[PDB]
Every structure is written in structure tokens, then in C-alpha cells.
């Protein structure tokens, strides 16, 4: 029997002996991660030797104001030794030995479009010190995209691209970027640049291009970003800590993330991928039964499993599609579904044409602003990835199939069923079934093949 | 740390090294069940041993017709040798041996109030090859409480109850009754001539131990032959121990006599304060009960009863679950107007509701969706209140709607730590007893009670 | 038999004969209230003599505006001889004898956040004399803290507090502010600094912090305030009439307002806690039927008996739980349960990060401006009776599913309530204290004897 | 100052030093009522002493069918030694004396059309012992007028009113009565025939003469009359005589004595001013001082009450809070009761009548009177006297004035505004005032000129 995630707990399948398993913490091992004793050593070695800039102690003097830019609880690891408490813990003792004071200090979690931080969630990212330390004070904001007294205009780049940036990463004096190298789907990287042309824009500057406009912002401020990124394992554990000028520091730590995140193991070409997506996963709870929320998850799948899967690629999913729009933190998907089932809309990428007109609503904005809930644009930032190259897909286990197939995913009700319905139909009755358990509760990578 | 159910999956807690775990079956061991190999000769010899009535053989004649009562899908088994199939096969062996009819044998499924049984839930019941053999000829009927035309008013016992039993048993040569003898919160087991009782009988005949032996004893007065009884012993994991067959009424002392061994377990050293454990979606009566307000309640209040004899007078429950306010409504398609009447009326607690039950039962859309939609008869919430007495407080730890746990009288927090520690706060000190009941809705719960 | 109040008339308790009674003023007696033949030789010798500043007509002359701040009803004596009417009347006669006309002098409603004042509010607020002298020439304003262009920015005070003012307490040449010195819940009083903080300010600048923002107005408009604040006691009579820089007679003033509202009286630590809450007290009618009113009304009678009840107190409560929300008064508080009941919220606090978004509703932010009801973020200025009391017991409800879905227990009788209460948590000998006409009267905060 | 009721608690008045004041039971006391001590030897000689029937012990043997009719829960006291308590306890010890099985007693709560008793309510009027010795038998029944298959269609009277009557009581062997005799608004007594009339009976039947003809049909139809225990009540529903035998000539008997109780002689001067106020809970139950129809009822009766001391420029002034609490769980069809009377061309009250057999007939509205403990929807039906006699009403301090503005009253803030409105235009500057302070705390009188 073979145990996949189900809502909450899990669903047994009986699949054929044939089936293989990958759970990428198990089967391909990856590089060491740093032991807890030598963390402040490599961090410390890491902020002494930055590349292409000064040390902090020599960018740094008394009254200059610093902004440090702080990724939110999307990505990441929340433990008590993660790479963002480590990091800022040591920024800090670096600016005060260099001079500069508590009260100066300002600390912005950089969401973009994610919703904004509360207090239990700076609690968790921060921790508990750096929290008491700074909460209180009002040192710490989440990024507000549409704070116009907050937004400053850079612009636009070379290629025509806005700009808009936040007012307070724009006024300091030694701005500080704080992010996670870890893999995408599309095959880029969560480095630096990425993630302060992510985070600190708004919705218009978001619809080599996050290079061009990071860069733009260096030029305008006058101070390129100072970088302290670490390479991420499965685990959320730091293996290599690199600091410094973004764009000189992205190769060297990408060199080593392609070492993590692309993992040689298929020695043949699957037929069926089998998996399944808990409810509370990625972006947050309700991801895994809100059906666009959960084409987004398959299409994630579909690209990091590409090149191991065949072409007539079948996916059996188990998901409860109970039709829990999570309404607090997504306001906007039950409008954006009932317009993509009632219009003239055959398939999602038919649905890009309404992005300005949901980015702009007001009570979706409100909503983003003081409620803590999703940008409407973030919808629109992948869903058709799925309805091509796989044959079909099924969602198993739905508590309102309705909604799985409303987006044009086939359901069924027991692994065993759908696993038979695919061989009659698609894989024929010798299919190469991939198990993948617990592949969206660890840091996903792209299977490749040993060639 | 410690693993409890919480929805579909399990919610860890950390408590303190004072903390007792009991598992119903793992704990303590239930007395030993027959082995798969020996059902053959213990079912063929209860049979060929009926208590207090002669054998089937002698009951069963040429053109006879014979009706078969079988329990609903809510606790019977439902592995590859259960009570209900083995015992249905071997008493379709024997009458086949005894010159009975095919077309003359009539399967009746007695849920009484709870849904009726669709195509899936009755292959569960009986197995593929009893399904197969029997459903397409139209010989499985669900009962139905509301089906006039095949209701028949019996009259009245001695204590002003009226009696309205399934016209197809009342009209039956031989009536046969599958039991399983398991226990109760209340103590009542549930095989014997309670399953005839509630099983058979509509709404009026419930809402009036004794009176299910008395409503069943006048049933066979009026039918003029008993009813047969096969009622097999089962342990925490639905597994037959002994086999008892015959007259329901002296039998039923017998099997008792085994039930109470089994269900009463005697593990138990200091008084405990703070009970723990989670809810699951789906258990007992079926998914949502871990998230309807009612079923919840009812759940927690057969928790209380349960463990009410080794648990002290300001005793704190903690439990787990996801309280999504999902009422399930394609199945309790009443419990949100009862709920709404709940808040909404001069009510300040639950037993303040029973004056509207006659209101439900009467309904016509919930009687149209019990009948011909498969839901419950809306007379079930009716037919939950211990908890908010002897418990001190009640904790619901994770819930998504806390709103609804707050508006039965349940106290919400976040985790088990926390909740843990209000309840150290006020209730229990700062030194309680803790008793930790993991797996306890996926089991057949038993009556916890002290070693001495 | 015991009399507590219930919505309008009066619920009846069998109380147990060890129960004691509290009743402010009636139990310990006040120190003694000002008699009414020395009310204008008090007021006289306080404006003559001011603490830390000079007369009203060594700062008054022909032409300089002034601006009197003045509270709104929900606290204060509405007699004829509040310390309101008095105060206004000496104060215009002083002005008038330095200089000033009628004409120029300008009254100020200061509710911050509570409704605006009405015609009535206004009738009861001044008197007959003052409505008619000042009202019909347009010269008595309620305090507005949504009107963008009556609003000025101070800036940030040094700890990082915003600051927004009202404008025509700004641009007069002698602002005069009348309080009232009142014990609050939470330990500090009230009028002086507090009232000039949390009175002609915003939202934003109410979300030692009062002292802070007061001084920043100060400094701003370069005219320290002129405070002529009255200790009331339990029946809003004057005690003693204070006057001049606040800073420096808010001690003076507490010195005497201790003696008052801290009681010494307490022999032994009670279990339970018996009262009962009419429907109009405090913030007007419905706070004794409203759920989030309840609650905070729960809440601050927990902190004004904290010293005086014991670890496991119990709370019994008996109010008319109509669900009668006074929409035109409160038009949030319906969708601020809704949400309370519908989301994530475990408790009372995990609701503060709605705030901003109440505040800034446009409808609500109409509602308060033009209908006089309160301002949207009232209800986040709760937890203290989850976090200490035991279990609360609201008797007499109505509908007793909002008191239910607020965390409270509820009952139908004082004597089932007791009854649960002694088996469940507090045993079969329980210290039960019975307070008569607790939201009838201006509540102390109770201590020991010793 | 003058106190009144006033929703729950009291509104105080200031009136002038001519108003007079008038309490049912203290201003005028009542005839002396036999003490506690004296009910027992009082309640066994009325019992022995029979006007016109023999003895209970005469009809009473082996294997006899007994009904006993309680009153409902609206009038009647429910002491300690109230008339039901004690009567039905003297009745059980008579007939167990006399040989009667306790199966064979049946107890029938007269409703008609009041809502159907509870568990609560049966235990307050039964008194604990006789509650615990009865109900969970099954031997307390509440009146059910729309149970079919327990109403017996008797047939006609010589005026063409039909007969329904409970079966329970039609088949019984022995059918007693308990009544309280008090008086009414129209000049009837509500013990009697008149209980046998309205407490049995379905709604066409109640579609003083009348009472007494339907009930002697119901006797000539049964073969045996019904055995009347009648016990005449003060204010305070304490009993002063007690008269039990042939109801029809014994009730001149009852009269004779509650005639002294009803009619007080307290008048010197004809008032011109009525001051009161509508408690919230009184006569029906909760929600009669709030709910506008049942306001109008109790203003009506009012003004049958004190018509004959009054003037022709009659004003009333009423302290009531009218916040549109209809009460709907005990009064759901008052509500499209009052939205038919808005919203059609009912110029006045007695307009409606037309749509009795409308509201009656209704299924949702019977379902919850026999199901949920409401009113009968023909009871609204069965309010025109106060507009036609009164010069102006005054409904003070009402909380949705637009209800009492609704039904033709006059809504103003204060007692004090109120009464200057009405000296200024109907009663002059020089009135006379009575107030009457517990008016609708106690059993009211029919007051009328001292001479």
C-alpha cells in the first residue's frame, strides 16, 4: 500500500509492484547541510568577505538610516536556527559594532502580493527576541503595494518596464536584502534580485526582466542592494551563506543551488505520476481545495516533472475539493471563478484579460490592505501548463467534484478507480507509475534523467 | 509527544510525563475472539443450538416466507468474514436445506431513523456475492418510517406506547433478526430486542431497557410466532466472540453475560482531572459528525458517559477538532434550522429544545429528503446534555469556525498547549491528572472504570 | 431577597444569608461634597487662583479668540448644578469682565470618538441659559474627527505616536479645557491631559501616552492649556475644583481623587461576584444588551473587583439579551459579531487586527459623521473576564445564543446559575457579594481593609 | 411624582396635586376571602355540598372514565393553595375514596386557542406533586383545536352555531371542570359554561348566551353535565368562596358574589385624563405591552373598564415601550397581520375581520401552534372601541413610535409632554387626572359612580 496526503491526513492506493517512489530527502541525498555549530562561522566569514561590496562595518556610520528587507512566511524555514533570525541577528551586531542605533533600524517584510504579516505571523518569522525587540517599537511593516503615500516612481526601465518601489527602502541609507536561494518551477531561482523586484513593487511593475528592474532601482538609489542569501535544502537548512552585491553573488550561489535543486535519478520515462496535495500547503490553508489554487499546484508539478514523465503523462491527485474557498485570505476567487464558468472563456489563459480589472477593484484592495488577504492581482501573476502535455488528470477523493470539474480535471473516488479508468483509456496496462508521497510538504525539486 | 485525530489527519500535543494513554484494545485485551478457521463450527452449532426456540429447520416449511432483519451500515463490521454475512449465508444454507423458496425470502435492512441504505452502502453490508445474488431481484428494502402504506399500527402496550412495526416483518412466516450485541454509552446493548425496537419502528414508537423488551415482547404477541434472534458478541475491532441464537428474550441475559466482560475494562489507579483526545470527520453516524455542532455535542456527551466513573467532579475535556461548520446538509438536512432555533429562541441550553421535536418530526421536505434522499429522519437529533453538567469546562482545540463550538457552550482555543494551560489556570491547578484517549473514535469504545 | 437590576426594572435573587452588599457611597461614605452655598466661592477662588499659570484675565483681551472644550454626556453630572454649567458660567464672566465679547467665544463638544452631540445631547450637556445664549448663533460645535479640513497634523511626538488636532481648538489665542476627575477602570483617571488626548483627536492618534501627545499640542500651539477640572463623587457632586497648567495640578487633583475612588473596605476574598446590568448605562441604551458592550462592561467590572475577589471567582450577570443591537447608535457592531462568530477568532483579542479596517469604512465613517452614532473603531480602543473569572453567568437573557456565542454561560434564574456555580467551581460555601445599582452609580474600585 | 410600568421597570410623571389614584386592591378593599387555614373545611363543604348534581361520590364507581379540565396558564393564581392546586387535590382524594382507578384519570389543559401548555408551564399550574404524579404517565394533555382525529363533530345548536368538541372529554365517564371565577372587559365571567365554551372548542365555534347554549348542547349530547368546581378570586387571586355543582344554576350563585368583587364604587368626579402604562409582560404573556395588536387589545379593554367614569373628551396616556417586539416564536402571524392592515384598504381595525377565515385556515401558522406552543391565528380575530371612543391615545416613551403611530395612537417622549399636548388641545387647561399606577399588575375592576 502507498500513503499519499489527503486534506489532512491520508489516502491508501493500491498501486502495482512496479511502482517507484521518490521523496527528494531520501532517495538522492542532498549536499551537507552546515552543522548548528559552525552556522555563525560561516555566517560571519560570509558578512566579512561580501562580493563586489564593502562590510557592513565600512558602509555604515552613526544616523544612517538602514532597511532591512525580510521575506514573508511563504518560503523558508521557521525553526529556531533559519537562515533569516541567524542572518538578521548578525546584520545587527555588525551595525551596532559599526555604530548605528536601535532606534534607527527599520525591518519591512516583503509580501508584494502575499498577503500582509500580522502579528503571530512577524512571531513566527522573527522569532522571539528580534519580535520583542521590535514589534513593540514599530521597527517592523509589512510592504503595502497600494499605499500611495508609501509608493515612490521610479520610472520605467530600458524595456519599458514601470517601476514603483516602496518609500521606506527608497530613503535609507544602507538598504539590506535578506532572501532564500531556492528553485522555481520555471526554472529560475528566489535569489536576490528576484525577490526585491518582487516584493517591494506593486501589481503594475509585476505584470532578466527582475534584473533589469532591480537594477533600476540600484541606479536610482544611488546604493546597490546589499544581499545576504542562503542556499536552502529540503529541510529549510542553510548549506552555503553568500553576501554581497546581488548581481556578482547570484551566479556563484546558483552554481551550487543547481546542485540541489536538479536531481539526476529517472532511468526511464513514466507514464503515470501519482501524488497528492494536503489542504494547508505553499501559499497557505485552503490552497489544496480551492480549484485554482490547486491547477496552480498541478501545473507546478507538471513543469518540475517534465522531463521524467512521458509524453501521454497521466496525474491521479488526491485532493478534497469540499469547494472550501478560503474567503478570508482569497475574497476575490469565487468571483474569479463564477466569471471563468459563466463567459465565453474555453480555458484559463483566456482569463488574463481581466487582471486590470480585478488589480483595481476597491473592496479587493481594502481587503488586501487591512484585512490580510491576498492582492487580486496574484491570480493573475501557470494554470495552462496543466491542461496541456497530460492526457488527463484526476482528482480522487473530492468532497464537491463539481468544482475539479469545472476546471477540467477528471474526477473519481478511490485511486484503485481512476488508476484502472487511466490504463483503460490513456496508459495502456503496463504504465511506469511514479509515487511521489510528501511532494508538498518538503522543498520540491526537478527530476531529470541519469543522461 | 502525543498523537490525537484532528479532522482526517492527527494534531500533536505535548503533555506532561504524568499523562496515561489507554487504547481500547492494545491496553487492556479483550477476551480472546474465535479464530477465522473456528466460525464454521461456532456458527454452525449455535444455530443447530438455538436458546428457548426450536431449530430453523422446524420453523421453516415448504412456501414459507421468510423475512430477514438486517442492521444498518453504523457499527456491524463490514471486514471479509463478518457477523452479517457469515451468519446470513449459513441461515441461507440451512433454509435452502429446509425446502424454502428463493423468491420467498425478503431482506430488510433496519436503520429505523437513520438513512436509508443505497446500492454502495448495502453492498458493504452484505458482501459482493449477497448483493449480487439478492439486490437486483428487488428482496433488499431499506425500512421506511414514513412509508404508510407499509407501516402497520400494532396498538398500544401497558404503558401508553404506540406500536407501528414494518408491514413486510408483520406479514413474514418466519422473522429472523441479525444482532450485534455491542455496548452503549447508557449501558443498554445494542443487539437483541432494542434492534427490533428502534429498527422497525417509526418515529412516535422512539420519542415515547424496559420499554424495548415490552415493545418487542408485543410485537410477537401480535405477530403470534418470536422473533428469531442471531446476535453475535463483537470486540473493539468488530470481531465475533461468541455466537448466540434463539429466543430473544432468555438469550439475551446470556450474551450480556459476555458483553459485560468485554465492555467493561478495569484499568484505572488515581481519578483523573483533564481528558484528551480528537474528533474525527467521519465516525459513528458518518462524515461531519466531527464538525456538526449537534454531533459533536453528541459525541462528547457519550464521551462523558463513558468515562464518568474514573474522572473526578471538576474534570476539564480537551478535544480536537475541526469545527469547518460543516452540517453536512445532503445528510442532516435539519440540524441548521435546529441550530438556528438553538440561538435564536428563549433557549439556554439543549434539553430546552425537545419541545419542537414533534415540530421536526412532522416536516414534510425533511420526511421528502429522508424518504427518497438517503438522509436522516429529522426526529434523530431529537431522540446531549450530560456534558454541559459534569464537565467543569470543554475544550474544542483547532477549530476553523470557533463560532459554532462557543454557540453550544463549548470553550475554543488554538492548541493543546494553551488550552492545557487555561485550563492548569482555573480549573485543575497546576498539578492535574491527565488521561490521554488517542484512536478513541476509530474503535468500539468501551466503559473505563476503577481497578478495584 | 435581593433587587438587581434587569434591562428596566428588576430581577430577584435568593441570595444565602452570608451575602454581603456594596453599595458606593451608601457603604463607605465619600468624603463630603461641596455644599451648594459654596459652589461660587470655590469656583471664584480656583479661577483666581490657578496652579502653575495666571488668570483668565491676566491671558484675556479684546479680540483674542477662545475656545472652551467641554465633554459630551456619556460622563459628568447632568444637574443644575454640574460642575459643566457652573464652570462655562464663571468662566464667561471672568472672560467677559477682561475683555472678550460673546460674539468671538466658541464651545467645543469633545466626544473623540463617541457620537456627536444632537440637539438635546447639547439642551442636557449646557442648560437652558447656555443653549439659548450660544447654540442658535452656531458658536456650540461637536467635535468632528473625520472632517479632513477642520483637522490639523501636529507631526509625530519623540516616542512615535502621530498626533492630529482639532482645528479650532488650534488657531485660538486661549484654549480652556473642562474635565471631569474620574476614576477609570484600567487604574488612571480621567479629564486634564487625558480628556484633551482622547477627546480632538482621530482614530489614528488614539490607536503616559496621554501626557506625551497633550505636551505636543502645547508646544505646538504655544498656549499651555487652561484646565478647570472637578473631583465628582459617586452622585457627580463637586468635591474640589482645581484650575490652571495641567501638568501641574494633575497630581494635586489625584492626591484627593484616591481618597475617593480607591475604598478600603474588604475583610475577605469573595468567590462570586452578583450584580446585574440595566440597558441604558455608560454609553446610552442597548450597552446592557449588546454582546460586545456586555463584554467590555464584564470586563471592566473584573478590573475595578480584582483585588477584592479570589482566584476562582465566578460572575453572575443578569441582562436582557435581546440581541438588541442599537443599529442607529452602533451600525458596525452587528458585522463585527457576524465576523467574530464566521472566522478564525478563538477569542476577543485576535479580532484587534480589524481595526484599520473598520475605521476607514466609508459608510461608517458617514454614519458617525451625520447620523450621530460612534465612530467605527470604538469597539477596538474585553479579554480581562476570559482571562480571570472562572465562568460568567448572564441570567434573564432573552436570546441567549449572542451571550452564548460571546464565551458566556447562560442561565434563566439567579438561583439555577448559583446553584451550577456551587456544584461546578465554587463549592458549597461560597463568599458571595451582591452590588445593587453598579452601573447605576459611579463605580469605585473596591480594595481590603487591610 | 406618580410612578407607572413602563416596559419592565417604571417612568416617573410629574402631574398635577388633582390627580387621583386608584389601586384594585388597596384604594377599595375586596370582600374578606376565607383564610388559609379555612380553604380545607371550606373546599370539602362546597365538595358535600352540591347545586344541583348529586355528590362526586354518586357519580363516581368502579372502572369510571374521569376528565378533568384545568384553565389555561392567562388568569388564575399560582400560589402555594391556589383554586387549581387544592380543587384538584380535594377531587383526586374524593374520587380515590370513592373507588376511581389512577389510570383512568385524565387531565385536559383548556386552552382553546392559547398556545398549548409545556413541560414548565403545566408544572406551574399543577403544582409540583400533582406535576411529578401525572405527566410522565401521560394523563396531562393540552387542548389541541386542529387534531382531528381527537374533535368531535357534535353537530348544530338551534342558531346555527356548530359544536366541536374534545374527544377526550365527549367519551369520558365523569367530566369535571376547575374554573376561576373573574370578571371581563364586556361584563361576562370567565368561569362557567363560558370555559366549557372556549376552552374545548376549535376556532368556528368561537366564530353570554352563546357560551351557555353550546355548552347545554355539548351536555345533552354527552347525556351527563358537566361538574363544576368554580372558585371566585380576588386581585391577588386568593379565593372567597368556592361553588361546585350544575353550572347552570350555580353560576347566578357565583355572580351574586362576584358582582361585589367586580364593580367598585369609587367616583366622585368624571375623569377626563387616564395615566398607565403597559408592563411588557402581563395578561397573554411576554410581548403583549410591545407587540401593537395586543396594545390595542389591552387599551380597549381598558376603555371597557373605566368607561363609566370618564367624560366624553376621554384622552388616554400610556407609558409603553413599542420597540416592534411582536414576539414572533408566540405571535407569528401578527406580523403579516400588521403588514395586511398597513398595506390594504383597512381604514380601521375592524376592517380586518374579513381575513379571520384567511388566517385561521393557514397551515405554517397551525403547524406551530400545534408544534411550537404559539397562538392560534384566529385568536387575533376574536380592538375597535378604544378609536372610537376616546378622544386621543397617548403612547409615551415608545422606542419605534412608527408601530403606535401605526395603529392610530399618538406617540410623544415624556409624560410630561404628553399631557400639556393633550391639555392644550382636547381637555383644556383645568382636567381631571387618574392614574391608576397597578393597573395591569393586578386582577382589574369595573370602576363606576360612588352614587
Known amino acids: 500500500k502507498f500513503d499519499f496526503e489527503y486534506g489532512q491526513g491520508t489516502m491508501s492506493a493500491e498501486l502495482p509492484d512496479n511502482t517507484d517512489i521518490f521523496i527528494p530527502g531520501e532517495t538522492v541525498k542532498d549536499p551537507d547541510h552546515i552543522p548548528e555549530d559552525q552556522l555563525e562561522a560561516a555566517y560571519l566569514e560570509s558578512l566579512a568577505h561580501p562580493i563586489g561590496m564593502p562590510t557592513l562595518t565600512e558602509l555604515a556610520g552613526p544616523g544612517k538610516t538602514v532597511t532591512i528587507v525580510v521575506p514573508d512566511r511563504v518560503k523558508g524555514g521557521e525553526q529556531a536556527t533559519s537562515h533569516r533570525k541567524l542572518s538578521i541577528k548578525y546584520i545587527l551586531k555588525e551595525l551596532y559594532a559599526a555604530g548605528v542605533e536601535k532606534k534607527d533600524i527599520l525591518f519591512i517584510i516583503s509580501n508584494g502580493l502575499h498577503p500582509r504579516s500580522t502579528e503571530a505571523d512577524a512571531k513566527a518569522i522573527f522569532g522571539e527576541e528580534l519580535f ?55 526554472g529560475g531561482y528566489s535569489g536576490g534580485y528576484k525577490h526585491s523586484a518582487t516584493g517591494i513593487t506593486n501589481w503594475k511593475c509585476i505584470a532578466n526582466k527582475f534584473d533589469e528592474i532591480s537594477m533600476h532601482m540600484e541606479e536610482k538609489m544611488g546604493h546597490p542592494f546589499f544581499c545576504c542569501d542562503a542556499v536552502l535544502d529540503t529541510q529549510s537548512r542553510q ?118 480589472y480585478f488589480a483595481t477593484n476597491e473592496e479587493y484592495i481594502r481587503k488586501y490592505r487591512y484585512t490580510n488577504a491576498f492582492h487580486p492581482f496574484h491570480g493573475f501573476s501557470c494554470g495552462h501548463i496543466a491542461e496541456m502535455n497530460t492526457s488527463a488528470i484526476y482528482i480522487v477523493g473530492a468532497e464537491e467534484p463539481g468544482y475539479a470539474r469545472g476546471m477540467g480535471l477528471k474526477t473519481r473516488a478511490t485511486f484503485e478507480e481512476a488508476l484502472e479508468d487511466a490504463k483503460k483509456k490513456y496508459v495502456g496496462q503496463e504504465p511506469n507509475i511514479l509515487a511521489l508521497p510528501m511532494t508538498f510538504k518538503k522543498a520540491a525539486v526537478h527530476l531529470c534523467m541519469k543522461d
Open 132 to 186: 520583542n525587540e521590535f514589534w513593540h517599537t514599530g521597527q517592523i511593516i509589512s510592504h503595502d503595494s497600494e499605499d500611495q503615500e508609501h509608493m515612490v516612481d521610479l520610472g520605467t526601465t530600458h524595456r519599458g518596464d514601470p517601476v514603483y518601489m516602496n518609500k521606506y527602502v527608497f530613503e535609507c541609507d544602507i538598504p539590506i536584502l535578506i532572501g532564500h536561494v531556492q528553485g522555481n518551477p520555471y
Open 239 to 356: 548549506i552555503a551563506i553568500y553576501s554581497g552585491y546581488a548581481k556578482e553573488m547570484m551566479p556563484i550561489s546558483w552554481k551550487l543551488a543547481d546542485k540541489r535543486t536538479y536531481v539526476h535519478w529517472a532511468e526511464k520515462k513514466y507514464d503515470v505520476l501519482v501524488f497528492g496535495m494536503p489542504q494547508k500547503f505553499h501559499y497557505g490553508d485552503g490552497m489544496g481545495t480551492n480549484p485554482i489554487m490547486m491547477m496552480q499546484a498541478l501545473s507546478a508539478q507538471v513543469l518540475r516533472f517534465k522531463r521524467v514523465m512521458s509524453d501521454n503523462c497521466v496525474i491521479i491527485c488526491a485532493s478534497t475539493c469540499n469547494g472550501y474557498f478560503h474567503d478570508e485570505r482569497w475574497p476575490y476567487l469565487r468571483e474569479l471563478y463564477d466569471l471563468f464558468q459563466h463567459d465565453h472563456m474555453n480555458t484559463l489563459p483566456d482569463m488574463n484579460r481581466l487582471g486590470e
